[model samples]
Target: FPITLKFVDVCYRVKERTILSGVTGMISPGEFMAVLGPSGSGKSTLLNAVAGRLHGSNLTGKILINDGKITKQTLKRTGFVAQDDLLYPHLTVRETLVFVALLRLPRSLTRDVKLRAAESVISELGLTKCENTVVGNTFIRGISGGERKRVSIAHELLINPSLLVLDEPTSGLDATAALRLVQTLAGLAHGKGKTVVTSIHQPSSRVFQMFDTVLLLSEGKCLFVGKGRDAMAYFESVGFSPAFPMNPADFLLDLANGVCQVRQTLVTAYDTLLAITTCIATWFSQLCILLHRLLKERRHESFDLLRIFQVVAASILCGLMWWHSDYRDVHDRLGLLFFISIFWGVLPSFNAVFTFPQERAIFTRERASGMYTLSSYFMAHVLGSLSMELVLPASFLTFTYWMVYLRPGIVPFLLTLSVLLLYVLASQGLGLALGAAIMDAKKASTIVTVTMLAFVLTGGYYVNKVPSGMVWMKYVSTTFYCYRLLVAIQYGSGEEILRMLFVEEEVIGDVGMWTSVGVLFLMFFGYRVLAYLALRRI
Candidate 1:
């Protein structure tokens, strides 16, 4: 079934930050509509509201589909592709679509049928040439810019949604790629009876001709919304004209930015909507599917040459430094144990921050399309990361433990490894939480580094003679819990370890092994809770 997208008087804001105000517009099947405006013109904001992608923020509007409010069933017939619809670089074009089908298509469909559907879309999108090639990246060669964007659209097209809405589909693309993408959308609208509405920052004249309708935006407000061919005349009638020979898109930008510096109050004539029927699978089932996707999707980054080398090289470096420190050498052994705490406390955060920040765009775009529920996606994400997160630590410890020749026997080795793993979780969670809260990789990475450094300074291994008032810093430090636990497993308890070494009791935590275990567990879950909530607000 085709769609009639009607949103009247939509407005969005956060405190005093006004994003959109009383914007009105309508679109229908067999129409390729373009929302054109300058930067921050509320163009994407308006489109997102119609696509039901705007969530967790204060939004007011009535978004109707086919004369009714958008329901889950109706959402299946619509697809929303946002600016940052990132694709997995490691997976082949076909494999990417196949995985998307498996995760987003109805669970009732057999695997083979899903694969068939994926193949059909590949052929349709003219992606057959690169179907077998990995999507590619700067690190690993793959598809062309235009081809990659097609693959991005191909995934959404897999379900054959009747209404396709996109935000700035042509940005960053050269003239040829931009024109071709929009031309294809024109075919979908006019030839396939599908509805298309896309936002374009600036379009070439060739691309402008493909738009059947144009909605213009200005700093003042909505300027006009109607047939594409009529926009120029309407602007001219309103006492605005292009300064020189230029594309209509260029003219629109000038009008939006200037009435030629004229002051004018603009008046314009122009969602309780949810996710898709394909999300019909129970949340438990979605968890499994998303879990599988996350695991597979991350295999490349997890095993990336640089990352592998870093782990192995670091392992050997640490192991070589403390080669079999004798138990009698209390100072050396103490240094090794504390070193593990500090090393692991810092390492995992660097990687874990990318877990959410990198995935933010794709997550929000897919979430808006109703491909999966937040609960299932989150559970799968947590568990899937659990897999990729634990393995490196296990390997790092396995390589180092034997090399270091700390306490002997399988039980001692296993116990020590468990504490390291626990510490890894706490550190990774800190990174994930920071990334979720900050939503910027560089910023989050920096924050985690600073925060971890603070933890290390207060960690019992260093500066134990701090003023009593601030000693509680150790209580909140993951490194403190982990270092104490590592010591406990080696010498039976923090006190036991200190007594043997003749170190002052004040230098080591007095807590039992189980206390560190419980504290680490709390930190792990605490970070995750914060991560989830921060992600929700984003």
Candidate 2:
């Protein structure tokens, strides 16, 4: 039930700079090891290396856990908490952990057992008071900073893991909150029989005492690795000893940043080899769990009353304005069809633009932990949200189709709905591609707005007389293919409606409806593949 972690002469470098060098230390059972350093010091890097979360070709050294090779069994009970508080602002604290428990807990356990475990963790983290509160964002009032951090922590403690690795857990908390969080970890370390390794900056003396051992890092070099009380003694013997009733925390911190770098001799600990691997579930199981997560996280946004209302409002306005067009209203109907093309184009894409950017950090964090395969995550998103994505378009089409009256038959109605669905998906894929490629909401959204503008202008509804200089823009525009497909469905090349109605134009020029379908299918899957590849780059 206990674990020991030992690292050899670990040296980490990036771009010709040694960020962590010759750092050897150990954190054993029932001990809380704290790494104290200033901003940009190697504390976080060292902790990441120990947790096997560090990525790079130059990651050198052996991080041995429990004095042996890490196995799947060991990984299940080994937990890592990140510096950033990753939580869905929409969900309650209890809902957040329940989902994590459902996702991370063993598949063999029944739902009821998993729910019980979530409740138990909620109790352990003293989050019972705010269990029902939302894990809010800056825009909304959720649980406070301390409570939210606990929710972040509660994810790790859900299974009562024996080895807990945390990065600056007390960050952004008030003095009391920071102290309380440390004391809570102290309980987990000594009382609950777990080992903790955390990185901290300057700390109050009382809170400092909670650390059984301290590791000092300055500019990526280890200065001290010993008992917290003995930290000053070692530094003093090495010429940092100041005879004052000062917090040794301050004294050691002063030397850590102010003094030149120090690489202390490796404190070879009780021989140990330990790490955390994973017990990967079957692909199908991962898909189901991931699908469940996607549904829970996106359902509120997907089914938002405001979002639906916006779509319905547009439908009503368009339905009345175009209002059951015969060939006499051919231009108006064409405008309506273009509206459908541009509306779905911009709506789904702008919505999707935020999706990947918002979730990128969480995705990377979860991916590093090997929670689920990228395949499962993407599949869950695409497959699970398929219905959510289609609902609005279907509703909009139903509302406007009758009012606009492009064609009377159920056959035309079915074809129109089918084209709308494909067009929406293609637009959605474009949004995802931009979101993933840019991975910034503001930037990606701005880019998508401009991209859609280009697609719209060249879509042939506005620029029926495009110059030869830019005639090819329509070919690349998603609106071009979509509008052609919609027009084809409505009037079958428009020889009657557009060719005679406006002697200047013979409908929107596109080859075969089947050809457009074939081309749009490529965008449907093409942009998604690009989005997937973009995420992988991150």
Candidate 3:
């Protein structure tokens, strides 16, 4: 489906801060429009608004697709690539396209057809040479910056989108690379018969010449909207002109940004002159494809061998420290079990805190495109992360369980292992919630550390009984139930466990073995639900 996009009086305000004001323009098919502006001049806002990505902004405007009111159904034909290259570093170029194609293409298409379509997109984007090469990041070696940039574009192009919008597609490249990238975009517009709209920073004259039209902006206001070749004449009509050989892009940007004084409103005409239809996938199809891609990403990301080794080595060290404690000695078993509770809680949580923040950008990009619901993404992540959570903790427990020898028989061992896994999953839920609540990894880690510490201190192990004033703290602490269950599964009720720990009257919470297990599951669901809500807000 090909779309002719139009917007009139597009005003967006966030808490009295106006980001876009009366920004009106039209972009027709088969034309390349360059949105030019200085920093914070509403260039990105314009694109994001037109793409229907703005949230919580006081926006009032009429944005239409093909002269019809814009809706989710109509937006199916639009493809937007954000400024950041959100491509996975581990996936090869071909694999990346294939995954996107599966998510975007209609379910009616067979697997062979989807493969062929992905191959076609690779050739079209000129990524055939590096199709098998990984798109590496700062730490790993992979394709060139220019090729990486193209792969981002290729992701949006897989569905043969009719209305293509990009923000700063040439942000990080050198002069030659920038020009070539713009040339590729120009090719998509003129050669492939697609409407291309992008907000470009300062571009060389050669790159500027590639655009058929220009939308100039400054501080949320439109300065001029006209043909690229006629921009100089239009600016001169408004009492501003570049001296002889100044870069056209630079001149337009300066004029619009008030670096050179000119009339704020030039009153340019907003009229504009304006494909193959591809079936948009259903939500189920999108979810399935997203799940598939996420699982594949999990596989390609490589198990964190360092983390595994640390967990195993720590387990060994901890086992030696607790070294086959006498089962009859209540203090010995209680101390070792308490240490195990804290160990599982903290380590598993630390590993999971980074997962959500690391994947957030890709999630935002994909969800904003109407690719899938937030709940589907949340479910996929929970399932995908389960593998590592289960394996790592199980491995840790297997070594520590036999070595510590606090509990005997297969039943006790299995029960202990099961509770530990449950605790890890609960801790993982907390991590996911924190990561989604705070999008920065470092900040999320800090919050996780502080919050988990609070839970640990309130845990029954550290203070056998929560103070009367802070009695409610025990219920809020996942570590409390986890420690309670571990102690219960290994020993009996609180009477004996507390008696052994030398506090005959202290309450150590005999909330019942199954009750602790039930609460752990409840914590898991509760945290995951919070994560889903937080992601939706994003």
Better of 1 and 3 by TM-score: 3
All candidates: TM-score? 0.77, 0.84, 0.82
For model 2, which pairs clash? 64-273, 64-274, 65-273, 65-274, 67-273, 68-273
| lDDT tens digits by residue: candidate 1, 493-522 | 446555565454533456777888999999
Question: Which predicted model would earn the best TM-score?
Answer: 2
Question: lDDT score, residue 347, model 2?
Answer: 89
True-vs-predicted CA distance for residue 245, candidate 1, Å? 8.2
Ranking by lDDT: 2, 1, 3
Give the clash total for candidate 3: 0
- The residue ranges of model 1 lying beyond 4 angstroms of the native Cα positions read 4-28, 33-75, 137-140, 199-281, 296-311, 463-467, 493-509
Identify the leading candidate in terms of lDDT: 2
Off by over 4 Å in 3: 1-27, 40-42, 48-74, 218-225, 233-244, 257-288, 296-302, 437-447, 464-472, 491-509, 533-536
What lDDT would each prediction earn against the true structure?
0.79, 0.80, 0.79
Model 1: how far is 258 from its true place, Å? Answer: 8.9
Q: In model 2, how large is the Cα lDDT of residue 150?
A: 88
